[PDB]
Amino acid sequence: PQRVRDYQPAMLDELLASGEVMWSGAGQIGNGDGWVAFHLADTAPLTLTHGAEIEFTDTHRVILETLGHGGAYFFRQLTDGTVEGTAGQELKQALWELIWAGWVTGDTFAPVRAVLSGPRTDPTVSGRWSALPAAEPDSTVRAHFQAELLLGRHGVLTKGAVGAEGVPGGFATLYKVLSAFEDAGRCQRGYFVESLGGAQFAVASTVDRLRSYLDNVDPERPEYHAVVLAATDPANPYGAALGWPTDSEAHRPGRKAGALVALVDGRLVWFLERGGRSLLSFGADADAQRAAAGALTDLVSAGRIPSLLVERINGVAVLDPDVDAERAVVQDALLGAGLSRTPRGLRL
Amino acid sequence: DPAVVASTSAQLQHLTPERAARDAEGVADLLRLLGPLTEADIAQRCTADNIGAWLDGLHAAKRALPVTYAGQTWWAAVEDIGLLRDGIGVPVPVGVPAAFTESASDPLGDLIGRYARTRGPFTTEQTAARFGLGVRVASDVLSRMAVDGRLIRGEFDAQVLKILRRRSLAALRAQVEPVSTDAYARFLPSWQHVGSTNTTGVDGLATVIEQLAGVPIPASAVESLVFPQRVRDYQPAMLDELLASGEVMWSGAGQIGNGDGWVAFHLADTAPLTLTHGAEIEFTDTHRVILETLGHGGAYFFRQLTDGTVEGTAGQELKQALWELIWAGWVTGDTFAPVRAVLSGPRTDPTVSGRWSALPAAEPDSTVRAHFQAELLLGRHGVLTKGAVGAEGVPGGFATLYKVLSAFEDAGRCQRGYFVESLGGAQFAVASTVDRLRSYLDNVDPERPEYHAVVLAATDPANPYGAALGWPTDSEAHRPGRKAGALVALVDGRLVWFLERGGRSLLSFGADADAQRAAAGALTDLVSAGRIPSLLVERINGVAVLDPDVDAERAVVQDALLGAGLSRT
């Protein structure tokens, strides 16, 4: 909903059913949270990964061997004469374990919208469940497509982003294949971003676009554009290419699920951790926190994120008389943006 | 009082021309409600002549089963046969998943209780005679459950006792039976369009404001709790369309704090009547200035009031000098953007945006004002009562109002009957609505409640409590009232909860079983739609237990907050 100015969830299921995209989740988190990976249907076998390995009990084999030589099925037609009473709960728990490993795929995004809704016909398993096309075996073609895709996703492909991204053979194999590109000419092969200090292949056209945004040599007041981002969506250079600012010698943030990095004017001022309850101001500067706070407030008020009423910092969490300067600016910022103060120390 | 006993017992027993099973499935309900019955007894309850076919078809469909426990054969519903099996009766051999449980708390006693729930006066030996094991067992259960109030020694049926006591009352006086208090509190909301889907659009809101003319509502409650519930699809532009069109005209009356205030919408056709008088505060010079230029004028923007400078403390002192006049009730904005801003608090300049018009002169107190007020009051409440006149401001008190209402009754525009049970005894209303009031009447059946929760702001006129009914108990320190920003949640006529503010205490007041689930659900629906200005919080909940440990009274309250979700606890 951030990069598609108007997004009503019924806009997504319109694609999934049409047959142009494939969801194929491929990683499980806790309970009721996963790693989904939207592929395109034209070239699905390329961007897909090999199926994970699991225990493979017998009921799993029952779910397969029927989806295998067939197109797709409903939940009920997976097996015969089993009701939701006793065999259902074992069949379902066998299913949602088979999908997070990545062997079956819903024909729409309706179930996962529910498995997040928390335990409260059943909505958890509704649409048609299809066996998933086997990922293309690693070859030269897979390599070229992955390299071109990465170049399309990131602006300037670095040694960093290939690290956070999961590609076989490490950055060493890409540099071998991208050199073949640079020879043919589809890539610039210029030192574009300085601190990366490597070989950023990028593309001929992107550099012309990248050369803008270059800070003007004369002094000027900053623009203060605040853009809040989920800590693990590819439009987040930190943790992948730029690396984190080295602060809080022991306590370190990362690309954890559910965390928020709120970077304004490129530099990251804050970091939320696990939905509130931790704020990680990194070398704050006054009136920049104002912009990030405005960002967070418009976000919570638009409803994209569950409200944050729980706040702490590194160790100075709430009303410490030992109050520091760096903890002060955070407070003066959050109160000014209108965020509530001292509703309670805890929450059940 | 013997005569009315036969009639009610007839109605209880589903043994009248009305209330007679007229279909095949219709009897099964009658059978599970009245308990097992002999077929010949079913025949006189049904409207058909041949009842054997219905029963045997039901049995083949396994909806009701034959029974032969006593000499006479009877027909119990399959839901009771699994329980009746604990008695002398024998269950069916064929597998029936309805008989998953065989023994209840006490099966042989409970069937006696349901038996008495339908009958009136009865004798102990008669209970066992129709269906009973031993006479000693009969006198046991009677002295049993005496603490539970079941089977009180009414004449020889505790819930029936109250019904007959009521109905036997108002037999000497030629009056129909009064309506229950809970029924009235179920009636007053829908009598003002709350939850109704008829009312919508601009016409709907011009209908609502009609009957809510005189009352003052907190500015934060308006258009968040009181209007968006009546008008099914409320958009804050609509109320701006009325106000600008010259059709209604808000006029504040007293402020509660820095932000919120009382704002009381008048209809424009008859404003001079439902207008109160000025607040009679002390007047400095700048106030005389504002009231001068607005004196002979129709409206003026903020700037034109004090030609000169309006910026800085020279003019900013005039802003605060004006927003003092408005809350007093002398000037009103030609729209509802200012008051929409005042409640928003600080971060041109809003809060003086629209035109500011002097207010039409309040009608000098007279008979025609008394007449109009006595007319209007009957529109807001179903049945005017000596109570409601109290909580509402009336410049003559109930004493002088009651007099002109007598002229109304003698003219024939209102019936002086005794309509609601608990209340004073000289309440009355218009004739047409009494019919509507006669619905919602609790039928004399052991029926399970509907659990249709509803949530109102405490100052909302739809809240009967404190107006006519009166607060049910102040047995301890914490007292509830009609303070601003307080919510009153009520599943049926009786209220279960109360909130003092979005984060303040909560009153478990009723402590009823399983009703708190629906009430918490309704609170959740409001919070989700965004109606409540905040998300709900409760720290001082209960008696101010604060939930450090579990108490016996609160037991279900927490588990209910888990039921809705306790988005904050």
Nearest CB to A347 within list B503, B547, B568: B568
As a whole number of angstroms, the distance between CA B146 and CA B157 comes to 11
Q: CB-based contact (8 Å) between B540 and chain A?
A: no
Chain B residues with CB inside 8 Å of A343's CB? 503, 537
As a whole number of angstroms, the distance between CA B520 and CA B508 comes to 12
Touching A: B residues 220-249, CB under 8 Å? none
As a whole number of angstroms, the distance between CA B326 and CA B252 comes to 6
Residues A307, B539: C-beta atoms closer than 8 Å: no
As a whole number of angstroms, the distance between CA B173 and CA B176 comes to 9
Residue with tokens 């503010």: B501
- Shortest CA distance from B535: residue in chain A: A307
Dihedrals φ, ψ of B314, to 5°? Answer: -60, -40
Going by C-alpha positions, the residue among B309, B276, B303, B273 that lies closest to residue B290 is: B303
Residues A348, B566: C-beta atoms closer than 8 Å: yes
Return the ∠ at Cα B43 (arms to B41 and B44), rounded to 5°: 75
Resolution in A: 3.6
Going by C-alpha positions, the residue among A140, A159, A158, A168 that lies closest to residue A49 is: A168
Residues A348, B569: C-beta atoms closer than 8 Å: yes
Is the dihedral angle over the CA atoms B22, B23, B29, B35 positive or is it negative?
positive
How does strand B261-263 pair with strand B248-249?
unpaired
As a whole number of angstroms, the distance between CA B291 and CA B331 comes to 8
Q: CB-based contact (8 Å) between B344 and chain A?
A: no
Going by C-alpha positions, the residue among A269, A310, A275 that lies closest to residue A288 is: A269
Per the DSSP assignment, residues forming a β-bridge with B262 are: B218
Going by C-alpha positions, the residue among A99, A162, A156 that lies closest to residue A129 is: A99
Q: How many CB atoms lie within 10 A of CB A319?
A: 10
Residues A347, B566: C-beta atoms closer than 8 Å: no
Are the C-beta atoms of B362 and B295 separated by less than 8 Å?
no
Dihedrals φ, ψ of B249, to 5°? Answer: -155, 100
- Chain A nearest CA to B346, separation (Å): 10
Residue with tokens 């494939």: A22
- Shortest CA distance from A301: residue in chain B: B530
Nearest CB to A343 within list B503, B565, B566: B503
Going by C-alpha positions, the residue among B412, B403, B415 that lies closest to residue B374 is: B403
In sequence order, what DSSP letters do the residues of B96-156 get, joined into one string? -TT-S----SSHHHHHHHHHHHH--S--HHHHHHHH-S-HHHHHHHHHTTTTTT-S--S--
As a whole number of angstroms, the distance between CA A57 and CA A1 comes to 39
Q: What is the 3-state secondary structure (H, E, C) of B263-292?
A: ECCEECCCHHHHCCCCCCCCCCHHHHHHHH
Are the C-beta atoms of B138 and B128 separated by less than 8 Å?
yes
Chain A residues with CB inside 8 Å of B539's CB? 344
At a CB cut-off of 8 Å and minimum separation 6, what does A177 contact? A143, A144, A147
Q: CB-based contact (8 Å) between B568 and chain A?
A: yes
Question: In residues, how long is chain B?
Answer: 569
Going by C-alpha positions, the residue among B499, B492, B491, B504 that lies closest to residue B540 is: B504
As a whole number of angstroms, the distance between CA A52 and CA A55 comes to 10
Helix (H, G, I), strand (E, B) or coil at B186: helix
Residues A309, B568: C-beta atoms closer than 8 Å: yes
User: Which alpha helices (DSSP H) does B148-196 contain, by range?
Assistant: 158-168, 181-191
Is the dihedral angle over the CA atoms B399, B433, B414, B213 positive or is it negative?
positive
- Chain B nearest CA to A222, separation (Å): 23
Q: CB-based contact (8 Å) between B569 and chain A?
A: yes
Touching A: B residues 275-294, CB under 8 Å? none
Are the C-beta atoms of B245 and B336 separated by less than 8 Å?
no
Q: In this structure, what token pair is assigned to residue B18?
A: 């009305």
Q: In this structure, what token pair is assigned to residue A116?
A: 């997040």
Radius of gyration of chain A from its Cα atoms, rounded to whole angstroms: 24
Going by C-alpha positions, the residue among A133, A130, A125 that lies closest to residue A107 is: A130
Distance of alpha carbon A308 from its chain centroid, rounded? 20
Residue with tokens 């074992």: A90
- Shortest CA distance from B563: residue in chain A: A120
Residues A343, B535: C-beta atoms closer than 8 Å: no
Q: What is the DSSP letter of B429?
A: B
Q: CB-based contact (8 Å) between B438 and chain A?
A: no
Chain A residues with CB inside 8 Å of B549's CB? none
Going by C-alpha positions, the residue among B341, B333, B337 that lies closest to residue B358 is: B333
Are the C-beta atoms of A264 and A226 separated by less than 8 Å?
yes
Return the ∠ at Cα B271 (arms to B266 and B274), rounded to 5°: 75
Distance of alpha carbon B458 from its chain centroid, rounded? 12
Going by C-alpha positions, the residue among B502, B514, B509 that lies closest to residue B563 is: B514
Distance of alpha carbon A151 from its chain centroid, rounded? 18
Chain A residues with CB inside 8 Å of B535's CB? 307
Going by C-alpha positions, the residue among B214, B424, B246 that lies closest to residue B334 is: B246
Residues B503, A348: C-beta atoms closer than 8 Å: no
Return the ∠ at Cα B419 (arms to B415 and B420), rounded to 5°: 150
Return the ∠ at Cα B41 (arms to B35 and B43), rounded to 5°: 115
Distance of alpha carbon B120 from its chain centroid, rounded? 30
Going by C-alpha positions, the residue among B238, B151, B169 that lies closest to residue B203 is: B238
Q: How many CB atoms lie within 10 A of CB A42?
A: 7
As a whole number of angstroms, the distance between CA B327 and CA B248 comes to 18
Residue with tokens 């009969």: B138
Q: How many CB atoms lie within 10 A of CB A272?
A: 23
Chain B residues with CB inside 8 Å of A347's CB? 568-569
As a whole number of angstroms, the distance between CA B84 and CA B333 comes to 72
Is the dihedral angle over the CA atoms B265, B268, B272, B278 positive or is it negative?
positive
Per the DSSP assignment, residues forming a β-bridge with B341 are: none
- Shortest CA distance from B561: residue in chain A: A348
User: Which alpha helices (DSSP H) does B212-363 contain, by range?
Assistant: 227-230, 236-245, 271-274, 285-293, 312-328, 337-342
- Shortest CA distance from B528: residue in chain A: A303
Going by C-alpha positions, the residue among B159, B194, B195, B196 that lies closest to residue B180 is: B159
Residues A344, B539: C-beta atoms closer than 8 Å: yes
| Breaks in chain B, after residue numbers (C to N greater than 2.5 Å) | 156, 347
As a whole number of angstroms, the distance between CA A178 and CA A186 comes to 9
